[PDB]
Amino acid sequence: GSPEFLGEEDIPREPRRIVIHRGSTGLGFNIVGGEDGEGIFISFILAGGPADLSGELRKGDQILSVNGVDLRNASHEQAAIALKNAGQTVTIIAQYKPEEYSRFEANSRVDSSGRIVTD
């Protein structure tokens, strides 16, 4: 049978809830943004870290809130503090915003499925 590749399918752009149980370890991702009230975006997911293990976050996701704390207009340092101090159970509302994200990373653009491509 002819194979069905996930790479063709559009990445969902609606907000999602992600609950990460990480005890007293790092979440395992990097954030960019929070200067200009641009928003807080995931720039990197660590292999094997709690965010990776969730399978529900990706580079280009905007972090809308953590544990009900709205980060849409957060400053960078306060966003990091909110995340680091969120406790063992971390409830993130995230929304995939690859076009906005692509402005941060050099030579990056969005293809027809919404995937971020770096040349």
């Binding site: 991702f29 990097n30 954030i31 200067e35 660590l46 960078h76 995340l83």
Partner: peptide, 7 residues
Amino acid sequence: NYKQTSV
């Protein structure tokens, strides 16, 4: 834009 933090 420039800051990046691991969390």
